[PDB]
Amino acid sequence: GGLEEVLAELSPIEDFSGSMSLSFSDPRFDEVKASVDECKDKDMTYAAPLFVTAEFINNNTGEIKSQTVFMGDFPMMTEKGTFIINGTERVVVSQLVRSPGVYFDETIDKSTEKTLHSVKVIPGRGAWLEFDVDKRDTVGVRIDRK
Amino acid sequence: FFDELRIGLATADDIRNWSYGEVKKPETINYRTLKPEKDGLFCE
Amino acid sequence: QDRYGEYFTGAMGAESIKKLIENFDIDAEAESLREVIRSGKGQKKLRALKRLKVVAAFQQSGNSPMGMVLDAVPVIPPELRPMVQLDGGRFATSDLNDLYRRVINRNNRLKRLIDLGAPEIIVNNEKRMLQESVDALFDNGRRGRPVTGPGNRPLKSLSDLLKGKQGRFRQNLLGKRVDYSGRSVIVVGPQLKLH
Amino acid sequence: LRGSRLYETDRNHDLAPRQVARYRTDNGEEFDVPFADDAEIPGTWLCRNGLEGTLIEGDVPEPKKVKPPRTHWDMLLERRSVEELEELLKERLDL
Amino acid sequence: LTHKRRLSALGPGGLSRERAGLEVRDVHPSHYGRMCPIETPEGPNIGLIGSLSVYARVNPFGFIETPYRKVEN
Amino acid sequence: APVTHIWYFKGVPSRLGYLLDLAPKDLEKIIYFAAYVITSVDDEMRHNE
Amino acid sequence: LHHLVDDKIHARSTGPYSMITQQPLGGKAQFGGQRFGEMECWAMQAYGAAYTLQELLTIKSDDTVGRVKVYEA
Amino acid sequence: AKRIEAGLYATQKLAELAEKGEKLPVQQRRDMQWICRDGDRAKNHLLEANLRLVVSLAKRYTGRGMAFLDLIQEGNLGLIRAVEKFDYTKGYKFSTYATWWIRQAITRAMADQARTIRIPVHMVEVINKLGRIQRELLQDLGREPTPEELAKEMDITPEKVLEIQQYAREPISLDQTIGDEGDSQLGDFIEDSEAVVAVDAVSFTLLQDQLQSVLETLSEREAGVVRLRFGLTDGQPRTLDEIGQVYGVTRERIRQIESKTMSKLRHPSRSQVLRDYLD
Amino acid sequence: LTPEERLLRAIFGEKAREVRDTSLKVPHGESGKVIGIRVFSREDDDELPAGVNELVRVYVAQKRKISDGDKLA
Amino acid sequence: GSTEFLPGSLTERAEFEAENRRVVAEGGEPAAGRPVLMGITKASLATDSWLSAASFQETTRVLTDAAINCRSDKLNGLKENVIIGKLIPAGTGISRYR
DNA sequence: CGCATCCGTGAGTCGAGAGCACAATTTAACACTTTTGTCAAGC
DNA sequence: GCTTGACAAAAGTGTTAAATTGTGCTATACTGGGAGCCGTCACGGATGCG
């Protein structure tokens, strides 16, 4: 799941000059605090508490301080597909975005009128990498917009 | 009844003459009694 | 400096530029530029023309270029940067007066550092910070990354108050909201006269 | 949504009487302040340029009871006595 | 119902209303069965906001799939 | 400490740059304490010694 | 449709003003004044209606003393 | 540290001996000034040496309404203080003593300069204590702690907790983007509450016109006492004696005149025209 | 209080009351029956924002008939 | 020539000819001028009124140039009059009808 | 010298939506005195 | 109508006790940040890198 994926991405963690580590796992939802119309009338968010088991390890001795931690109130989706925030019903609209990948294209130059081809690598996060072909018939690269 | 509007380059002397007092504190208003603080911003 | 300290003088910061302007003669520069314009042909002529465009302004006037270096920044009246007590006790403040505060803070710290004789590195760093704060006060985001407060929205500087489509020129001077006016939907009246 | 900030018959013929003072600053800048006839003029005033100004007439030199701030030397004394400092100075002077 | 099936090109990581040319807001052949070519704002948001089609489904990678009947011979 | 108005420092063109004939990149380093600039040189004293 | 003249009719003669510019506020929520935009000024100049434009831009917007004196008159 | 102390004592000795003359040998004086210069150089060298520690400690307090470079500068000021107070005799590493002063200077500067409305340090301490207690409570309670529980835990009344929370409010920017577009800001919706209301400003001048004219004039000279009593002639209310200080009228007679005028001016025939301006 | 207001109060024997009116009044151009009222008082739980002791909501419902200017489609 | 004009600057034909005919009397060295076409943006932005130029576009640059040049504005341009609040010099606003 | 980078500017007009220890400065709090007004009989 | 006189009721000062606030100090050792970066799009014009 999404929460499990994010937690796995975060953990494990070790401090600079590693001597001890921490990790999170196993998200769990127990039950919604209140119901739909109670939240709508009383002007409160319709959320449920979230619990994650955190494990702390001491590399020197090999201890395990594993136990559950309260992550906060996660807003929940109603049967209609809406979020009740502060007693108001809200909708999250899907967003159209260019997917990450490698994209090639070509353009006709103005001076020489040669066909010049370029490629760009678009990541989710990271420096931008893009190659190019010049009108002098040379293959170059711009690294991190340099 | 205006004849003309002249723009120029303000000097230190002009800026000092425009002023009625030097601001030498970043305080704007005290937390209780919500009144302007002396020698700071909004000083009376 | 150690070998020939008394044979020359050097400096950094706005003070050095102030000294340069103070000991910079404009008549000789204008004459030299004119002679280069009438003589030179290549890019030298264009550079001389562009430089003369600026030099002649100070030459043929009663104003000196010393105004480009500031020894006392002015402060706008508080009403134009109001601290209004919103309903319920909340306070809304124009971010302009925030910028001012920073300046003062830094300008105070420098006064302390010079007082107790801090090492030149710290004094220079403080002077640079004061320069940047004043720059952002006059025009935020021009040179470097704009100064931001809560969230990530850049602060509104003095220049921004009258710069573009919003501001004063095109929003409060050339067209404004007026009293004794209304608005409503229109329907066709066929029995009406043309007037 | 509204906010707030922190009408009497105007008259110019009749006004409360006033007397004008005169102050000089350290730089020789002259300033004038209109005070009421109640007087009680202070010996020192704050002028528009941010510097203390004193009366032109030259009266009431204030006692100047201010105390100087604590220096590095005072802070040194609180952790060292004169004997150890003298010994250190003698040791350094040899080189 | 139509609000919950809205596909928007704006928002963080998306387009800006002042920096969107004709090409992005025009109808593309791939839209068939995924993005409705009719339902869209009339004002300056023309072509930047649309609606999901009746049969369209979202791939876990985020791509929109549409059903077709297999025909052979 | 004196400061320079940003408008005349860099405005495309730089008014200070044209007035003194220093490139904006060089003028930038002086203002922000990145490199020293010579304000005056004693030619007569140098020649005599 | 949800476009009824009942909830869009408001007029104004005098109401709240702005903190800094001292001009009338806008919007039916307050006693909003209609904006006399730049194009309207161009139209008035084309007509040659110097006096109407002057009263619109000074008396009826932000001539603080003029507003109360005109009401009294 | 020893060089700095030696230079300090050398300059102090020079100052002390200056008053009592007693010119010293040239060599000794030159050596004394050399010690002073060496001590100053040592002080500086220590400062540049520990600027890195200053930066290391300063980088921990980012994102609390203060610039990173301002934090660094305040930290190095605290480090200057620490150097002034450092004692080499105890034999401890300079960093151990310098960290305390650097942290103190950074926190004090943040307290004094991190808010548009300045709160004294003694209130900032209370606010920080409240925040820490609330954070601790949220973990174990699971719910949101109520004001009464916090008040009990801090040995103060709940009203004090509410007052502290009110003081914790932060002013909002008057240049926002209410409107979902670069069209309107927050300042365009806050009406001025001091602008002169036209109609009111008219009614008042009518009340001042319909009162000063009719009822004042039909009272002959008995109007004068009323005018001074309420000060409607120059905005200067006057006590009874302030009429008798010059004019020969006596105290109780003035009050009798006031009572008679008050009684007879409330007659409906002349008390109905002015009965509509009460609001 | 202004001298004129002081005299007016004196002739009518009206107390200079400590409190000013800030009652919630119906906005301009509104109408309809009152159908529901909700009250929250800090005394009976009612976890209101800090500083708020009472919160009152009033619902006004009105029946609108089609009239000139309404938009149909 | 002996004129006040800087070389390479855009000068109005009226002022150009007036200056040439004024200097030819005693100076006898008129300046040489070539007709030039300019766009609406540059033509409008070159107006002698710094108020209107600042109101149009490039407020910062216009104000900077006006400040260094120290050039005053005579308030008759049909666009600064509205800013000042003075009735425009057109239609009913001209002196003849006013 | 000349080419590629970089920079500033423009975008319809209305709408609806961490802590303690002092020392110094200011404030409430009470007591008391002076000024103001009130009631009574008076000729 | 115009005074005199005997009394509560407020306007003003004095002096204390209390609340608020401005500075200073704390000794294991600790020594160069982190946010980056997202389709105009065309137009000139200045800059600066080689």
3D structure, described in words:
The PDB classes it as transcription. Keywords: transcription initiation, rifampicin resistance. Mycobacterium smegnatis RNAP open promoter complex with SigmaA and RbpA. The structure is cut from a larger assembly and holds four copies of chain A, four copies of chain B, one copy of chain D (95 residues) and one copy of chain H (279 residues). Chain A has 146 residues and is mainly β. Chain A is built from two helices and twelve strands. In chain A, the strands form three sheets. In chain A, strands 1, 2, 3, 4 and 5 form a five-stranded antiparallel beta sheet that branches. A four-stranded antiparallel beta sheet of chain A has the order 9-10-11-12, with no helix packed on it. In chain B, 16% of the residues lie in helices and 7% in strands. By secondary structure, chain D is of the alpha+beta class. The N and C termini of chain D lie far apart (78 Å). Chain D contains two helices and seven strands; from the N terminus they run βββββββαα. Chain D has helices at residues 72-77, 82-94; strands at 3-4, 18-20, 23-24, 30-31, 34-36, 44-46, 52-55. Helix content of chain D is 20%, strand content 20%. Chain H is elongated. Chain H starts with a helix and ends in an 8-residue tail after the last helix. The interface between C and F is large, with 46 and 33 residues. The structure holds a DNA duplex (43 and 50 nucleotides).
- Rg on CA atoms of chain H, Å: 37 Å
- Secondary structure tally: strands of chain D: 7
Structural class of chain H: mainly alpha
SS strand fraction of chain H: under 5%
Measured as a percent range, the helix fraction of chain D is 10-25%
Q: What profile does the largest beta sheet of chain D have? A: 4 strands, antiparallel
Report the β-strand fraction of chain D as a percent range.
15-25%
Q: Give the neighbour order of strands across the main sheet of chain D.
A: 4-3-7-6
Multimeric state = part of a larger assembly
Sequence of secondary-structure elements of chain D: EEEEEEEHH
Query: Pairing-aware structural class of the strands and helices of chain D?
Result: alpha+beta
Number of H- or I-type helical stretches of chain D: 2
Biggest interface found: C-F, 46 and 33 residues
Protein name (chain G): DNA-directed RNA polymerase subunit beta
Family (chain G): Belongs to the RNA polymerase beta chain family.
Protein name (chain B): DNA-directed RNA polymerase subunit beta'
Organism (chain B): Mycolicibacterium smegmatis (strain ATCC 700084 / mc(2)155) (Mycobacterium smegmatis)
